[PDB]
Amino acid sequence: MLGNLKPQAPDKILALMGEFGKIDLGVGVYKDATGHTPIMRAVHAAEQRMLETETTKTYAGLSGEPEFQKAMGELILGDGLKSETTATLATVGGTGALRQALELARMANPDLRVFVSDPTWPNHVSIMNFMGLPVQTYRYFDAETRGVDFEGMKADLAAAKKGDMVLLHGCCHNPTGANLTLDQWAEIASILEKTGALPLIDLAYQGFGDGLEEDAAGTRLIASRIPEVLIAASCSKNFGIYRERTGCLLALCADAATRELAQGAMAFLNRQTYSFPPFHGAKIVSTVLTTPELRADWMAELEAVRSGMLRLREQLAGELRDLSGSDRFGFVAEHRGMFSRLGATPEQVKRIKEEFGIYMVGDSRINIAGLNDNTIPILARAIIEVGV
Amino acid sequence: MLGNLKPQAPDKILALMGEFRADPRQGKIDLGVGVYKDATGHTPIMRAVHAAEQRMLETETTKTYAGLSGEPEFQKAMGELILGDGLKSETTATLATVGGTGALRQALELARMANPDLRVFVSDPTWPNHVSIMNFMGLPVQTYRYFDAETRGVDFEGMKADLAAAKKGDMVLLHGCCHNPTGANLTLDQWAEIASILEKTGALPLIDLAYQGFGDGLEEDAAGTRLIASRIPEVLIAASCSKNFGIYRERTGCLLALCADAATRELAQGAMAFLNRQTYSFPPFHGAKIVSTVLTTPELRADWMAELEAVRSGMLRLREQLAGELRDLSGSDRFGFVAEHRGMFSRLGATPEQVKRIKEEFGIYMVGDSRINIAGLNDNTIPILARAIIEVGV
Numbered sequence: 001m002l003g004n005l006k007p008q009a010p011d012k013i014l015a016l017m018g019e020f021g022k023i024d025l026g027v028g029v030y031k032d033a034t035g036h037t038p039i040m041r042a043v044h045a046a047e048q049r050m051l052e053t054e055t056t057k058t059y060a061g062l063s064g065e066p067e068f069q070k071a072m073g074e075l076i077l078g079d080g081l082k083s084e085t086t087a088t089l090a091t092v093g094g095t096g097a098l099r100q101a102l103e104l105a106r107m108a109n110p111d112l113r114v115f116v117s118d119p120t121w122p123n124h125v126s127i128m129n130f131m132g133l134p135v136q137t138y139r140y141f142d143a144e145t146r147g148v149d150f151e152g153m154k155a156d157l158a159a160a161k162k163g164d165m166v167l168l169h170g171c172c173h174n175p176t177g178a179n180l181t182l183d184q185w186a187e188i189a190s191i192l193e194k195t196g197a198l199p200l201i202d203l204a205y206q207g208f209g210d211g212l213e214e215d216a217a218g219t220r221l222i223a224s225r226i227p228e229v230l231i232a233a234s235c236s237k238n239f240g241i242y243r244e245r246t247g248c249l250l251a252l253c254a255d256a257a258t259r260e261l262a263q264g265a266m267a268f269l270n271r272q273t274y275s276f277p278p279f280h281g282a283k284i285v286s287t288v289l290t291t292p293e294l295r296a297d298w299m300a301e302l303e304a305v306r307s308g309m310l311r312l313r314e315q316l317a318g319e320l321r322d323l324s325g326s327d328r329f330g331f332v333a334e335h336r337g338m339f340s341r342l343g344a345t346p347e348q349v350k351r352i353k354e355e356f357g358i359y360m361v362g363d364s365r366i367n368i369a370g371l372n373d374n375t376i377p378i379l380a381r382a383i384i385e386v387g388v
Numbered sequence: 389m390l391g392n393l394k395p396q397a398p399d400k401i402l403a404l405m406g407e408f409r410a411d412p413r414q415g416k417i418d419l420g421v422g423v424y425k426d427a428t429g430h431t432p433i434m435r436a437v438h439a440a441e442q443r444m445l446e447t448e449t450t451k452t453y454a455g456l457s458g459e460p461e462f463q464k465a466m467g468e469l470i471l472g473d474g475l476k477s478e479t480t481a482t483l484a485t486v487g488g489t490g491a492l493r494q495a496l497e498l499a500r501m502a503n504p505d506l507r508v509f510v511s512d513p514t515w516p517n518h519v520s521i522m523n524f525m526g527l528p529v530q531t532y533r534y535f536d537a538e539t540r541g542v543d544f545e546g547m548k549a550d551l552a553a554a555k556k557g558d559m560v561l562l563h564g565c566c567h568n569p570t571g572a573n574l575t576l577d578q579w580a581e582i583a584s585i586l587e588k589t590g591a592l593p594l595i596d597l598a599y600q601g602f603g604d605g606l607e608e609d610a611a612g613t614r615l616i617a618s619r620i621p622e623v624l625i626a627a628s629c630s631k632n633f634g635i636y637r638e639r640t641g642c643l644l645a646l647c648a649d650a651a652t653r654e655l656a657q658g659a660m661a662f663l664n665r666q667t668y669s670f671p672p673f674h675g676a677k678i679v680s681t682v683l684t685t686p687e688l689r690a691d692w693m694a695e696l697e698a699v700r701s702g703m704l705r706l707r708e709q710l711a712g713e714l715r716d717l718s719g720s721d722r723f724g725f726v727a728e729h730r731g732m733f734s735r736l737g738a739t740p741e742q743v744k745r746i747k748e749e750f751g752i753y754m755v756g757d758s759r760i761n762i763a764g765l766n767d768n769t770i771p772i773l774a775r776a777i778i779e780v781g782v
């Protein structure tokens with residue numbers, strides 16, 4: 001039986017972990033001055049508090065715990081959370097939220113298609129391929145200006161049919177780092193409303209862009225216009241609990257009836273996949289969010305991280321500027337999030353990794369959190385050496 | 389679009405507790421619970437587990453992404469706990485999953501990848517979630533006779549006759565021990581014969597192992613699995629740490645793929661890592677780490693085995709007590725099966741009608757198929773259950 005198993009292609013981004021004066025600029029995890037991904041202060045305190053308060057580990061809720069569901073809703077939608085018409089499902093990380101999102105939509109529309117950005121998180125297409133869902137792309141990254149080809153994007157999206165799903169990154173677009181402004185978001189909402197396409201928002205970096213509330217701005221605008229929208233959130237990065245596997249799927253419906261319908265299907269979806277969702281991570285998140293003292297320090301630490309990385313981009317761009325006398329790499333300072341695509345070709349990037357020992361994702365995607373004052377000039381020189 | 393959704397039925401377990409709570413009777417009893425409960429009606433956190441969580445809190449320095457298929461310490465410790473000295477790593481693939489249920493879902497997905505025309509055989513009866521997951525996947529499900537309603541024991545003759553019909557490439561799901569919901573179990577000699585049937589048919593064994601340590605002991609409960617593992621070249625095992633470690637909500641389990649050779653093992657392992665990746669990327673870390681900590685740390689392990697044994701013996705005492713009470717009140721040994729059953733569950737064999745009469749007249753609740761949880765019994769509740777059973781005419 002098993003001998004008939006066909007070999008499968010690995011995760012190229014995760015492969016870099018294996019492929020690693022080495023400079024790690026691959027996998028999207030935050031790193032500090034000394035190349036460490038620390039546990040946030042609030043998270044540690046949450047765990048300590050949990051170690052004392054929990055008296056049992058019996059089966060809990062199939063859709064996650066109410067405290068988590070509520071906390072997460074308010075974090076993402078703020079005061080735009082109409083719980084009466086919102087369904088929530090605790091999933092195994094943001095990735096689980098996406099898979100669960102695709103399954104839910106496919107249940108309501110066997111003939112659904114998914115539109116993804118050119119380019120997008122490869123794992124998006126991987127999952128869709130596995131499920132056998134037709135994937136179409138829309139123009140997004142303007143290769144020349146390193147910005148967003150808004151004209152192209154609006155053009156392709158206008159071709160989506162009712163029942164189709166459009167996958168938008170809430171903010172901090174992985175892998176480009178190029179993001180839409182709120183004005184562009186309003187226009188996109190105009191298109192979606194007219195096309196009847198279901199918006200699927202992948203929110204994995206709320207807090208690394210421009211701030212907790214600012215990064216959720218776009219998602220809130222869509223939710224305020226479009227009567228039905230899906231949001232897949234990840235607590236992996238903004239809470240630094242990557243290995244805990246915690247996120248959630250939010251299903252915004254047009255009315256309570258549909259909400260009860262969706263919520264039912266979402267719970268059933270967990271039951272048939274792995275039964276209950278993991279408790280530990282969801283608990284840390286709600287504990288932090290519902291405890292004023294814990295929330296205050298978390299926001300602060302996330303702010304320091306976010307502001308610190310902002311500083312790094314400016315340095316890197318400046319370094320390169322002084323090393324070329326050209327505003328070419330200006331896009332680095334404009335980009336927002338953890339990543340930024342240098343625009344280097346596959347031949348160049350490979351040369352860099354083998355000789356310079358600096359490993360970045362094949363499409364020239366660099367994790368700016370992997371840089372620091374010591375490595376910045378080295379990277380600048382390394383890319384200056386060839387092309388760019 | 390979401391309005392086109394089909395109304396999905398509730399989990400039912402909630403509906404059970406719904407009527408129970410609504411019951412104004414001060415002396416009502418709940419034997420329908422599916423988790424373990426101590427003398428005080430609580431599901432405590434095992435001592436070793438609270439110890440592991442304390443050490444993890446002090447030593448963990450990061451929470452970055454870890455093993456896609458799980459961590460090595462967990463995989464090895466688990467394979468050893470299940471297969472003992474018989475663990476042949478060279479041909480064994482391992483996958484940390486989201487609980488035993490996740491392990492089951494992945495096993496089915498894996499097999500279906502290897503054989504599109506996969507057909508599954510499940511016992512009569514079996515854990516309802518088995519059928520639901522399979523129906524959801526659209527896999528053809530077959531049943532094999534297992535529970536004898538009259539003796540409350542295993543209908544082996546019938547089991548053999550039905551399993552004989554399995555074809556090359558079909559899957560046969562076996563409960564490694566403590567059969568949920570029945571409580572009736574196969575002896576090592578019956579396992580040997582089942583082994584011969586599977587060898588002849590060329591069917592792939594999928595062993596569901598969720599109660600290791602609740603039957604006769606850790607080693608004894610793995611006995612059947614180990615006989616199969618040694619005689620059958622390809623075997624899939626879905627283990628759960630929920631019950632025997634008491635970490636239900638943490639969602640810890642693992643899929644073990646025993647292969648004929650290393651080339652196949654590499655094929656299976658990759659396919660499993662891919663399956664995890666295409667579902668939720670990485671499996672939950674916390675629960676698995678508690679487990680690897682208890683099993684590797686001699687002190688904790690010793691205290692865990694000690695606590696599990698206490699739990700196991702306690703339930704066995706309850707079985708003997710209830711069976712004894714039933715013997716005196718009935719003037720016969722007709723209810724002896726209660727003491728022969730292993731696991732925390734037992735199917736009494738009462739008709740849905742008798743079950744309803746038991747609830748209304750004695751305030752004793754249980755699942756509709758007459759399945760009761762031994763752990764929910766105690767010196768005060770046993771005399772009552774004994775009398776209810778006999779008075780209703782079971």
Ligand SMILES: *Cc1c(COP(=O)(O)O)cnc(C)c1O
Pocket residue numbers: 028092093094095096121174202204234235236237242246247668669
């Ligand atoms: C991180 C990330 C996710 C989800 O990550 P999980 O580890 O599964 O929480 C989803 N999409 C993108 C773009 C991400 O960067």
Ligand SMILES: *Cc1c(COP(=O)(O)O)cnc(C)c1O
Pocket residue numbers: 274275486487488489490515568596598628629630636639640641
């Ligand atoms: C409990 C149980 C499982 C596993 O439960 P998980 O909670 O998902 O670890 C699987 N099969 C049977 C028969 C069970 O009783």
